[PDB]
A paper describes a structure:
Immunoglobulin E (IgE) plays a central role in the allergic response, in which cross-linking of allergen by Fc∊RI-bound IgE triggers mast cell and basophil degranulation and the release of inflammatory mediators. Omalizumab is a clinically approved anti-IgE monoclonal antibody that binds to free IgE, also with high affinity, preventing its interaction with Fc∊RI. Instead, the Fab alone selectively crystallized in different crystal forms, but their structures revealed intermolecular Fab/Fab interactions that were clearly strong enough to disrupt the Fab/IgE-Fc complexes. Mutations were therefore designed to disrupt two recurring packing interactions observed in the omalizumab Fab crystal structures without interfering with the ability of the omalizumab Fab to recognize IgE-Fc; this led to the successful crystallization and subsequent structure determination of the Fab/IgE-Fc complex.
Leu158 from the Cκ domain CD loop was mutated to proline, with the aim of altering its secondary structure, to disrupt the extensive, hydrogen-bond-mediated interactions. This omalizumab-derived Leu158Pro mutant Fab was termed FabXol1. The Leu158Pro mutation alone was not sufficient to prevent selective crystallization of the Fab, and the structures reported here were the result of unsuccessful crystallization trials of the complex between FabXol1 and IgE-Fc. Two structures were solved for FabXol1, in new crystal forms, and the space groups and unit-cell parameters of these structures, FabXol11 and FabXol12, are provided in Table 2. In this structure, the network of hydrogen bonds observed in the FabXol structures between β-strands of the Cγ1 and Cκ domains is indeed disrupted, but the engineered residue, Pro158, now forms other crystal packing interactions. CDRH1–3 residues in both molecules of the FabXol11 structure adopt essentially identical conformations to those found in the FabXol1 and FabXol2 (wild-type omalizumab Fab) and scFvXol (omalizumab-derived scFv) structures. They form similar crystal packing interactions to the first interface described for the FabXol1 structure, in which the heavy-chain CDRs contact the VL domain AB, C′′D and EF loops, and the Cκ domain DE loop from a symmetry-related molecule. We mutated Leu158 from the omalizumab Cκ domain CD loop to proline (omalizumab-derived mutant FabXol1) to disrupt the interface with strand G from the Cγ1 domain, and although this was achieved, the FabXol1 molecule still crystallized preferentially, in different packing arrangements stabilized in part by the presence of Pro158.
Residue numbers in the entry:
A (entry chain L): 1 to 216
B (entry chain H): 1 to 135, 142 to 221
Amino acid sequence: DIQLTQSPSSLSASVGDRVTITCRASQSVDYDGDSYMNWYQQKPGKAPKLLIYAASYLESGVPSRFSGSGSGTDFTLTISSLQPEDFATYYCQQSHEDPYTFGQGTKVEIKRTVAAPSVFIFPPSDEQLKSGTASVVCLLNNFYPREAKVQWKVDNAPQSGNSQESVTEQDSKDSTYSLSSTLTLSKADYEKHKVYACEVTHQGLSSPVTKSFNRG
Amino acid sequence: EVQLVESGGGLVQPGGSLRLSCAVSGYSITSGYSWNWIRQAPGKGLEWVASITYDGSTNYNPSVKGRITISRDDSKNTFYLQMNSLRAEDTAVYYCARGSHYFGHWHFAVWGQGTLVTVSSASTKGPSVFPLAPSGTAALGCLVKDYFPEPVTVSWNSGALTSGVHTFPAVLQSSGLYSLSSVVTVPSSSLGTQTYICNVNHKPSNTKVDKKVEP
């Protein structure tokens, strides 16, 4: 098979900047004056979209900021000026021979200015407590960059091993992220303590932010 | 415009069989140069697995060959993927796609929406839905807890409320079940004047829930 290696595996670029992604093939994909390398864009939850075919041809309806070059084993996808809606994973794909193979993908996000999260905490619902479990949720809303630290404290005691996090894709409206952390306890455990707090550390915060509630 | 609509995805036992369908509209299936299936395991890249050309010739990725069959029904404008002896490595979103008459044929300009196949012995389980009640801007949401398999969909106010919504990717819990939440930020003043209902659908378990979220 023809193996394809993309570089880099991920990148962050300021809005409007030029982005370059390369693909290297283990054998030539040239055939009769053409080079059979293609490029796709895949946005979260969607099918891939064809951008470039036969190395340099722009697929109908794709914006002209996308272009492709190269021949033989070495190819480049260029976004001349990165737009907020261009958050996606980009794939190269050779069509010279079956099995048609795809590169591993390059994730692209927009590097905007630092933005601190807005933090919210949610107690378990009474409905859930009837079931014998308590979920406490901490929300970090509309922040950049994606990296953040969330620490749970119960009656001031730091927690470990009993929470899970989830992060949204970058929102193209403002190039930010949101994140949830969910602390899970048995009902009996939840009723044994009073103070529930989530403490947030982030580049945009000069000191950590804690949101808390007292059960009751 | 041409549209490719897939169906037949779902939860199947290891060693079991799947049959996927791709119904083509706005285009004659007999005019495509080739029709293809391409899959994407969760969090991973893309793998072409099968093709059928206009003259009926089929071709398969050796990674799966021996337990895969692609076919066409021209009278229903539909083509199919049959897979048997399924393994956990076959869990993936399966896409259908059309190839081209030009420039080497085997690039894909038109794709279906994808359908998820989950190979597992775990049972179907519908979620519980719990409110995340609101305490200038307030946040509220719904916690969708303990379901299997994926996916669930969430909307707010039957689709009328989209601004400020963030629906999180599901997380797999140690129990083997999924959970996710959906949140929305709204003006603090609207909490008296406005109704907020999250609409949750877990089609695999026939579970449809509308949950009013109030202070």
